[PDB]
Amino acid sequence: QQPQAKYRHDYRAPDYQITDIDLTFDLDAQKTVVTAVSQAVRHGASDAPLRLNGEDLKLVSVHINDEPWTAWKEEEGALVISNLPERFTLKIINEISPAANTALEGLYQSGDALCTQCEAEGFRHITYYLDRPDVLARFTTKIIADKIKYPFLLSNGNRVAQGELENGRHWVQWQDPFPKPCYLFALVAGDFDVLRDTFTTRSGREVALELYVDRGNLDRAPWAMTSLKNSMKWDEERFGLEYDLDIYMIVAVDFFNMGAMENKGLNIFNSKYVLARTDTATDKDYLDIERVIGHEYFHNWTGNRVTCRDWFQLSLKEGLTVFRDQEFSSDLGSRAVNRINNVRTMRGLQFAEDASPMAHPIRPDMVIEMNNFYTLTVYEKGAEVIRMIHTLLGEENFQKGMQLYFERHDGSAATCDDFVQAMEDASNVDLSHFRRWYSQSGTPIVTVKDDYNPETEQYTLTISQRTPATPDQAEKQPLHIPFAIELYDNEGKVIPLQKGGHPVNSVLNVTQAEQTFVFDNVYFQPVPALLCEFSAPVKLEYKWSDQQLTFLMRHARNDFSRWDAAQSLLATYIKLNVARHQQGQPLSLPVHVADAFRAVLLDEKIDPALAAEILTLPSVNEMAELFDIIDPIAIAEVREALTRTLATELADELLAIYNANYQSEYRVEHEDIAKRTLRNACLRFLAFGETHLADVLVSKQFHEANNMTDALAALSAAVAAQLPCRDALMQEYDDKWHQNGLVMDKWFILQATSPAANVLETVRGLLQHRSFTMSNPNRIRSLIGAFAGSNPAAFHAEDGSGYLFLVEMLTDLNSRNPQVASRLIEPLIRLKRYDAKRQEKMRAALEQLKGLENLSGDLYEKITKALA
Ligand SMILES: [NH3+][C@H]1CCc2c(Br)ccc(-c3ccccc3)c2CC1(O)O
Ligand SMILES: [Cl-]
Ligand SMILES: [Cl-]
Ligand code: NA
Ligand code: NA
Ligand code: NA
Ligand code: NA
Ligand code: NA
Ligand code: NA
Ligand SMILES: [Zn+2]
């Protein structure tokens, strides 16, 4: 009964297009009546039927040119209409029930509001349609509703008509002139406060900006409004792109599965990426609002004006729009901190996916449930692939490629290959080999050996690559890997790269399984910086000495290299001490390693933004990727022991830097954020100082904080170090904040990731907490998702209790909200990375889920791959 996989190689142009669609919604939460009048054109064979997609629709009538049609049949997921003219008007009336829509796909209820989510395939839950993104139609949308309950009736585009009716109903009609695929349709109905502002484009177009929030939330909206203006200005400055309509609407909703959504002129956002005030939102929340606002804005060109031919091309818009949001954040804020954190995500989360049963190329070849492919790979590795193009081309060529891409493909539904060809043609850089990045899954491993010849003053790098087979692909081939280097002399000075009397570009083209690169006029032995700015998404194998790495921490020119060298230095001793833990032996760390971090604390010339990241230890998920078999208990306990050892060895310096970075004024400004990140990085270690000194310092910060960044940092430390004040602070936060779901998400995450022995009992009990509900995806992800994904030590408890808990939760969510269920099953899919006893219990859990009545396709796809 489960759906069959679809394949990229089966793409065929549609037999029918729809050029124009006129929608009427007679809105109600229990029953909504949809009337859809579509102007259709046959492109395929004259005997081909029109095959419309539809899910959970009550069909009322079918007309062709106003003739009630008899030549049709409903089948699973479809309405098949036969014997049609070449051009005709299709009219469908059908009913849907928003209040019954717990999957939050299609038209559904968010509190008292009605709203939509149509990407990927949600529009077919609203009416029978060609729900495929290469069908581009001009939408007009009339919305009829109770005026008191739904005073604001919004859809894409501009208001073209409005009226009032008997019995307290009213209506508004919207027209969006840009042809669109139906995944970009949106409708919102409700009562809102509205923040209104203006942006004037550089050529003088005045754009009305409207942010819709629940009543009472206006004073939480200005930062999101500011961020929207900042996004608009940056896309003009950096990409030369202006907004193309008259209004820009954003609606914040509390119940939302997919983060935020770029519906043309009517974006719909999870409230978490809109609402901010300094007592409730952290610096990270502010910068996440900025990047998500930006992301959705940037889709207006990379996604909307040029869309996707088919869903296997998702990375065409997502890799590129992620690249754009990273460049936006990096330009406005700290580029080094942005790059560092994106590399942490790549190495600590995406690499894990690319070795897992769900591994796929950034352009997938095979999909059962497309909502399963909104992945770290498609997004984050997708962006790394765009960034490699940028590295190979340089900014000027890259922008020429963007310009050619839009010139060729504006107003169409294009492919990844189209984008690469625009870059290649505009730049004259050959990207034929490079295209293999779109079709090959898995993480390449780049191995480097070096040799310095003092007789000839030559330095030689011998560089090899391989990609291990993945479950989806038995054949792997070498990639075009841009491999950036820098060479340092004994004084930390950069050595010019040259060969044979000519300069050599610092981006080496590693295109073979093995190759050598020779550099001459290297007068003294160098220290290399390798894979600079993480220039390709690969694992690097080079036999660093500790000295080389601490040298780079002191001398490397790019801040990213200094951080990356610290990561390599730590990796050795993380691996050492995990092996020790497994044999019952305590942490061992050479003095000279602690001294490298001491020097970072005491170096006045280092940007505090960088120092903070160097002093932020790899997460347990980053640590896991260092190991062939993951021991999650050893990893967690070593991370804590390492924290404690550094806290003890660096106690005086940590406290001095903590105090020196105190700020009495709170500002959401990048220099202030950096000082705070450094202060709070020190706090994490100071929390493991002598128990009473730590307790006082942490509780004081919590109670004196004039912003949520500092309050949450203290609370997190009390939980992490199990300090005496923990229970009191956690109860104070609950009593203060329990009516604020976004704020309580932070508290649920702390509960779920607690090191306490009784964490699972506490998490289970919190299913009954006043601020928790299974009806809200944010609450689910903050409590259950954080437990399973961010507390692998407790999730992987050797008694199997974490797996049984997740099975209970997934048994509910499989029926309630399969998209959220599929995000939450991911930790179980990784079972082959664990020891045999854990694998057996995880398989038993997955086999239980496999046997569920009414197993969703979302879970079926992942379970099948995991149990293979
Ligand atoms: N097209 C939508 C799909 C929904 C979606 C998912 Br699912 C996962 C991550 C993001 C996202 C990624 C980065 C920034 C902001 C948001 C999005 C938003 C989107 O891509 O605009
Ligand atoms: Cl109703
Ligand atoms: Cl809201
Ligand atoms: Na910057
Ligand atoms: Na599907
Ligand atoms: Na060129
Ligand atoms: Na060597
Ligand atoms: Na260079
Ligand atoms: Na509750
Ligand atoms: Zn996106």
CSV table of C-alpha atoms in Angstrom, one decimal, residues 475-804:
chain,number,residue,atom,x,y,z
A,475,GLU,CA,30.2,3.5,-7.6
A,476,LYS,CA,32.2,6.5,-6.6
A,477,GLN,CA,34.5,8.6,-8.7
A,478,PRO,CA,37.0,11.5,-8.0
A,479,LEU,CA,35.6,15.0,-7.7
A,480,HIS,CA,36.8,18.4,-8.7
A,481,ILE,CA,37.9,19.5,-5.2
A,482,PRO,CA,39.0,23.2,-4.8
A,483,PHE,CA,41.7,22.8,-2.2
A,484,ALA,CA,42.9,26.1,-0.8
A,485,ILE,CA,46.3,26.4,1.0
A,486,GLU,CA,48.6,28.9,2.6
A,487,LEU,CA,52.2,28.4,3.6
A,488,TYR,CA,53.9,30.1,6.6
A,489,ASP,CA,57.5,30.6,7.4
A,490,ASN,CA,59.0,30.5,10.9
A,491,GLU,CA,57.9,34.0,11.6
A,492,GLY,CA,54.3,33.5,10.6
A,493,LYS,CA,54.8,35.3,7.3
A,494,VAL,CA,53.0,34.0,4.2
A,495,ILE,CA,55.3,32.3,1.6
A,496,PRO,CA,54.4,33.3,-2.0
A,497,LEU,CA,53.2,30.3,-4.0
A,498,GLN,CA,55.0,29.9,-7.3
A,499,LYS,CA,56.5,27.3,-9.6
A,500,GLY,CA,58.9,27.7,-12.5
A,501,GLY,CA,59.0,31.4,-12.2
A,502,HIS,CA,55.2,32.0,-12.2
A,503,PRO,CA,52.7,32.5,-9.4
A,504,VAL,CA,50.5,29.6,-8.5
A,505,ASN,CA,46.9,30.1,-7.4
A,506,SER,CA,46.3,29.2,-3.7
A,507,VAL,CA,43.2,27.2,-4.8
A,508,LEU,CA,44.7,23.8,-5.9
A,509,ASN,CA,42.5,21.8,-8.3
A,510,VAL,CA,42.4,18.4,-6.8
A,511,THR,CA,40.8,16.5,-9.7
A,512,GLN,CA,42.5,13.0,-9.6
A,513,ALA,CA,42.6,10.1,-7.3
A,514,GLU,CA,46.2,11.1,-6.6
A,515,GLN,CA,48.4,14.1,-7.7
A,516,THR,CA,51.3,16.1,-6.6
A,517,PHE,CA,51.7,19.9,-6.4
A,518,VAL,CA,55.2,21.3,-6.4
A,519,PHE,CA,56.1,24.8,-5.1
A,520,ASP,CA,59.5,26.3,-5.5
A,521,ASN,CA,61.4,29.2,-4.0
A,522,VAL,CA,60.3,27.9,-0.6
A,523,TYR,CA,63.4,29.0,1.2
A,524,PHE,CA,62.7,27.5,4.7
A,525,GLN,CA,60.5,24.7,5.8
A,526,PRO,CA,56.8,25.8,5.9
A,527,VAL,CA,53.9,25.2,8.2
A,528,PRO,CA,50.8,24.6,5.9
A,529,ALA,CA,47.3,25.8,6.4
A,530,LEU,CA,45.2,23.3,4.5
A,531,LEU,CA,41.6,23.4,3.2
A,532,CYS,CA,41.5,27.0,4.0
A,533,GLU,CA,38.0,28.4,4.9
A,534,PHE,CA,36.8,24.8,4.5
A,535,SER,CA,37.2,25.2,0.7
A,536,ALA,CA,35.5,21.9,-0.1
A,537,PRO,CA,33.1,19.7,2.0
A,538,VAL,CA,35.6,17.0,2.7
A,539,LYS,CA,37.4,15.2,5.5
A,540,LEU,CA,41.1,16.1,5.7
A,541,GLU,CA,43.7,13.5,6.7
A,542,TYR,CA,47.1,15.2,7.4
A,543,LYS,CA,49.4,14.1,10.2
A,544,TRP,CA,49.7,17.4,12.1
A,545,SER,CA,52.1,17.8,14.9
A,546,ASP,CA,50.7,19.6,18.0
A,547,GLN,CA,53.3,22.3,17.4
A,548,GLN,CA,52.2,23.0,13.8
A,549,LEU,CA,48.6,23.4,15.1
A,550,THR,CA,49.5,25.8,18.0
A,551,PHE,CA,51.6,27.7,15.6
A,552,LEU,CA,48.6,28.2,13.3
A,553,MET,CA,46.5,29.2,16.3
A,554,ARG,CA,49.0,32.0,16.9
A,555,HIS,CA,49.8,33.0,13.3
A,556,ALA,CA,47.3,32.0,10.7
A,557,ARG,CA,46.1,35.0,8.7
A,558,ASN,CA,42.4,33.9,8.4
A,559,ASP,CA,40.5,33.7,11.7
A,560,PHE,CA,38.8,30.5,10.4
A,561,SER,CA,42.2,28.7,10.2
A,562,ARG,CA,43.0,29.5,13.8
A,563,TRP,CA,39.7,27.9,14.9
A,564,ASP,CA,40.2,25.0,12.6
A,565,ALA,CA,43.7,24.3,13.9
A,566,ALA,CA,42.3,24.3,17.5
A,567,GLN,CA,39.7,21.7,16.3
A,568,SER,CA,42.4,19.5,14.9
A,569,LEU,CA,44.4,19.8,18.1
A,570,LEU,CA,41.4,18.9,20.2
A,571,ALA,CA,40.4,16.0,18.0
A,572,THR,CA,43.5,14.0,18.9
A,573,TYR,CA,42.9,14.3,22.6
A,574,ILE,CA,39.1,13.7,22.3
A,575,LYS,CA,39.9,10.4,20.6
A,576,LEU,CA,42.6,9.6,23.1
A,577,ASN,CA,40.3,10.2,26.1
A,578,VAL,CA,37.3,8.3,24.6
A,579,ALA,CA,39.5,5.2,24.3
A,580,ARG,CA,40.7,5.8,27.9
A,581,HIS,CA,37.1,6.2,29.1
A,582,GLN,CA,36.2,2.8,27.6
A,583,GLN,CA,39.0,1.3,29.7
A,584,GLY,CA,38.0,3.0,32.9
A,585,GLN,CA,40.9,5.6,32.8
A,586,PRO,CA,40.6,9.3,33.5
A,587,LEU,CA,41.3,12.2,31.2
A,588,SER,CA,44.9,12.8,30.1
A,589,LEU,CA,45.8,16.0,28.4
A,590,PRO,CA,49.4,17.4,27.8
A,591,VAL,CA,50.2,20.6,29.5
A,592,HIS,CA,51.1,22.3,26.2
A,593,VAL,CA,47.5,21.8,25.0
A,594,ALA,CA,45.9,23.7,27.9
A,595,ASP,CA,48.6,26.3,27.3
A,596,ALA,CA,47.4,26.9,23.7
A,597,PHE,CA,43.9,27.8,25.1
A,598,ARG,CA,45.5,29.9,27.9
A,599,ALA,CA,47.2,31.9,25.2
A,600,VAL,CA,44.0,32.5,23.3
A,601,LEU,CA,42.4,33.8,26.5
A,602,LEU,CA,45.3,36.2,27.1
A,603,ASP,CA,45.8,37.4,23.5
A,604,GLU,CA,44.5,40.9,23.4
A,605,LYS,CA,44.8,41.1,19.6
A,606,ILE,CA,42.4,38.2,18.8
A,607,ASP,CA,38.9,39.2,17.9
A,608,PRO,CA,36.7,38.2,20.9
A,609,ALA,CA,34.2,36.7,18.3
A,610,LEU,CA,37.0,34.2,17.3
A,611,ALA,CA,38.3,33.6,20.8
A,612,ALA,CA,34.8,32.7,21.9
A,613,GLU,CA,34.5,30.0,19.2
A,614,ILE,CA,38.0,28.6,20.0
A,615,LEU,CA,36.8,28.3,23.6
A,616,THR,CA,33.6,26.5,22.6
A,617,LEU,CA,34.3,22.8,22.6
A,618,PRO,CA,32.9,20.6,19.8
A,619,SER,CA,29.4,19.4,20.4
A,620,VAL,CA,28.7,15.7,21.1
A,621,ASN,CA,27.5,15.4,17.5
A,622,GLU,CA,30.7,16.9,16.2
A,623,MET,CA,32.7,14.6,18.4
A,624,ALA,CA,30.8,11.5,17.2
A,625,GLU,CA,32.0,12.1,13.6
A,626,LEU,CA,35.6,11.5,14.8
A,627,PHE,CA,34.8,7.8,15.5
A,628,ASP,CA,34.1,4.7,13.5
A,629,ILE,CA,31.8,3.4,16.1
A,630,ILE,CA,30.0,6.0,18.3
A,631,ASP,CA,30.2,5.5,22.1
A,632,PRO,CA,27.8,8.2,23.1
A,633,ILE,CA,28.3,7.8,26.9
A,634,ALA,CA,32.1,8.0,26.5
A,635,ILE,CA,31.8,11.0,24.3
A,636,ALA,CA,29.5,12.9,26.7
A,637,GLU,CA,31.6,12.1,29.8
A,638,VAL,CA,34.9,13.0,28.0
A,639,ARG,CA,33.4,16.3,26.9
A,640,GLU,CA,32.5,17.1,30.5
A,641,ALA,CA,35.9,15.9,31.8
A,642,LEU,CA,37.7,18.0,29.2
A,643,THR,CA,35.6,21.0,30.3
A,644,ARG,CA,36.5,20.3,33.9
A,645,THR,CA,40.2,19.9,33.2
A,646,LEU,CA,40.3,23.2,31.3
A,647,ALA,CA,38.2,24.9,34.0
A,648,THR,CA,40.8,23.9,36.6
A,649,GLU,CA,43.9,24.6,34.6
A,650,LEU,CA,42.6,28.0,33.3
A,651,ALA,CA,40.6,29.1,36.4
A,652,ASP,CA,42.3,32.4,36.9
A,653,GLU,CA,42.4,33.5,33.3
A,654,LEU,CA,38.8,32.4,32.7
A,655,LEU,CA,37.6,34.6,35.5
A,656,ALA,CA,39.7,37.5,34.4
A,657,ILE,CA,38.3,37.4,30.9
A,658,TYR,CA,34.8,36.8,32.2
A,659,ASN,CA,35.1,40.0,34.2
A,660,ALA,CA,36.8,42.0,31.6
A,661,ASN,CA,34.0,41.4,29.1
A,662,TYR,CA,31.2,42.5,31.4
A,663,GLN,CA,28.8,44.9,29.6
A,664,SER,CA,26.3,46.9,31.6
A,665,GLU,CA,24.4,48.1,28.5
A,666,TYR,CA,22.7,45.4,26.4
A,667,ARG,CA,22.8,46.0,22.6
A,668,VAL,CA,22.0,43.7,19.6
A,669,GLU,CA,25.2,44.9,18.0
A,670,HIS,CA,27.9,42.5,16.6
A,671,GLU,CA,30.8,43.8,18.7
A,672,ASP,CA,28.7,43.5,21.9
A,673,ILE,CA,27.4,40.1,20.9
A,674,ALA,CA,31.0,38.9,20.4
A,675,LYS,CA,32.1,40.2,23.9
A,676,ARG,CA,29.1,38.4,25.4
A,677,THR,CA,29.9,35.1,23.5
A,678,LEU,CA,33.4,35.3,24.9
A,679,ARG,CA,32.2,36.1,28.5
A,680,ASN,CA,29.6,33.3,28.3
A,681,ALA,CA,32.1,30.8,26.8
A,682,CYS,CA,34.3,31.5,29.9
A,683,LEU,CA,31.2,31.0,32.1
A,684,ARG,CA,30.7,27.4,30.8
A,685,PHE,CA,34.1,26.5,32.2
A,686,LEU,CA,33.7,28.6,35.4
A,687,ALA,CA,30.5,26.6,36.1
A,688,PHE,CA,32.9,23.6,36.7
A,689,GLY,CA,35.0,25.5,39.2
A,690,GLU,CA,34.9,24.9,42.9
A,691,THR,CA,31.2,24.1,43.6
A,692,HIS,CA,30.3,27.0,45.8
A,693,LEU,CA,32.2,29.6,43.9
A,694,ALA,CA,30.6,28.4,40.7
A,695,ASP,CA,27.2,28.3,42.3
A,696,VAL,CA,27.4,31.9,43.3
A,697,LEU,CA,28.8,33.2,40.1
A,698,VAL,CA,26.1,31.4,38.0
A,699,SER,CA,23.2,32.3,40.2
A,700,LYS,CA,24.3,35.9,40.3
A,701,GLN,CA,24.5,36.1,36.5
A,702,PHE,CA,21.0,34.6,36.2
A,703,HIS,CA,19.4,36.9,38.7
A,704,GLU,CA,21.2,40.1,37.6
A,705,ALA,CA,20.9,39.5,33.8
A,706,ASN,CA,19.3,42.4,31.9
A,707,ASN,CA,18.8,40.2,28.8
A,708,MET,CA,17.9,36.6,27.9
A,709,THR,CA,21.3,35.8,26.4
A,710,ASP,CA,23.0,36.2,29.8
A,711,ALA,CA,20.1,34.6,31.8
A,712,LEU,CA,20.0,31.6,29.6
A,713,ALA,CA,23.8,31.2,29.6
A,714,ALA,CA,23.7,31.0,33.4
A,715,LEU,CA,20.7,28.6,33.5
A,716,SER,CA,22.4,26.4,30.9
A,717,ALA,CA,25.5,26.3,33.1
A,718,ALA,CA,23.6,25.4,36.2
A,719,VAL,CA,22.0,22.5,34.4
A,720,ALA,CA,25.3,21.4,32.7
A,721,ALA,CA,27.3,21.4,35.9
A,722,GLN,CA,24.4,20.1,38.1
A,723,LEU,CA,25.0,23.1,40.5
A,724,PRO,CA,23.1,23.5,43.8
A,725,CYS,CA,21.1,26.4,42.4
A,726,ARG,CA,19.8,24.5,39.4
A,727,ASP,CA,16.4,23.4,40.7
A,728,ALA,CA,15.6,26.9,42.1
A,729,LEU,CA,16.6,28.7,38.9
A,730,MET,CA,14.7,26.2,36.7
A,731,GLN,CA,11.6,26.7,38.8
A,732,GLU,CA,11.9,30.5,38.7
A,733,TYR,CA,12.1,30.4,35.0
A,734,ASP,CA,9.1,28.2,34.6
A,735,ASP,CA,7.0,30.4,37.0
A,736,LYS,CA,8.1,33.5,35.1
A,737,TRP,CA,7.8,32.3,31.5
A,738,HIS,CA,5.4,29.4,31.3
A,739,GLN,CA,2.8,31.3,29.2
A,740,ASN,CA,5.5,32.1,26.6
A,741,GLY,CA,6.0,29.0,24.4
A,742,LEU,CA,9.1,30.3,22.6
A,743,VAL,CA,10.8,31.1,25.9
A,744,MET,CA,9.8,27.7,27.4
A,745,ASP,CA,11.3,25.9,24.3
A,746,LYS,CA,14.7,26.9,25.7
A,747,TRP,CA,13.8,25.4,29.1
A,748,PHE,CA,12.5,22.2,27.5
A,749,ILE,CA,15.8,21.9,25.6
A,750,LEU,CA,17.8,22.3,28.8
A,751,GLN,CA,15.6,19.6,30.5
A,752,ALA,CA,16.0,17.2,27.6
A,753,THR,CA,19.8,17.7,27.3
A,754,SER,CA,20.4,17.5,31.1
A,755,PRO,CA,23.3,15.3,32.3
A,756,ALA,CA,21.2,14.3,35.3
A,757,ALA,CA,20.8,10.6,35.9
A,758,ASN,CA,17.0,10.9,35.9
A,759,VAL,CA,16.7,12.9,32.7
A,760,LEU,CA,14.3,10.5,31.0
A,761,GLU,CA,12.0,10.4,34.0
A,762,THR,CA,11.9,14.2,33.9
A,763,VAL,CA,11.4,14.4,30.2
A,764,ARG,CA,8.5,11.9,30.4
A,765,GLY,CA,6.9,13.9,33.2
A,766,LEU,CA,7.2,17.0,31.1
A,767,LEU,CA,4.8,15.6,28.5
A,768,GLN,CA,2.2,16.8,31.1
A,769,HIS,CA,3.8,20.2,31.7
A,770,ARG,CA,1.5,23.2,31.4
A,771,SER,CA,3.7,24.6,28.6
A,772,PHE,CA,4.0,21.4,26.6
A,773,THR,CA,1.6,20.0,23.9
A,774,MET,CA,1.9,17.4,21.2
A,775,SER,CA,-0.2,19.7,19.0
A,776,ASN,CA,2.7,22.1,18.6
A,777,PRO,CA,5.8,21.2,16.5
A,778,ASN,CA,8.1,23.6,18.4
A,779,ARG,CA,7.3,22.0,21.8
A,780,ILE,CA,7.7,18.6,20.3
A,781,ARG,CA,11.1,19.4,18.9
A,782,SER,CA,12.3,21.3,22.0
A,783,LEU,CA,11.5,18.4,24.4
A,784,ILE,CA,11.4,15.1,22.5
A,785,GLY,CA,13.6,16.0,19.5
A,786,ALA,CA,16.3,17.5,21.7
A,787,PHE,CA,16.3,14.4,23.9
A,788,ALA,CA,16.7,12.0,21.1
A,789,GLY,CA,19.0,14.1,18.9
A,790,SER,CA,20.9,16.3,21.3
A,791,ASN,CA,21.3,14.0,24.3
A,792,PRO,CA,22.6,10.8,22.6
A,793,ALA,CA,24.1,9.7,25.9
A,794,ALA,CA,20.6,9.4,27.5
A,795,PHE,CA,18.9,8.5,24.3
A,796,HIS,CA,21.4,5.6,23.9
A,797,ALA,CA,21.1,4.5,27.5
A,798,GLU,CA,22.2,0.9,27.6
A,799,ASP,CA,18.8,-0.3,29.0
A,800,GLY,CA,17.2,0.8,25.8
A,801,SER,CA,14.8,3.1,27.6
A,802,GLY,CA,15.5,6.0,25.2
A,803,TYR,CA,14.5,4.0,22.2
A,804,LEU,CA,11.2,2.8,23.8
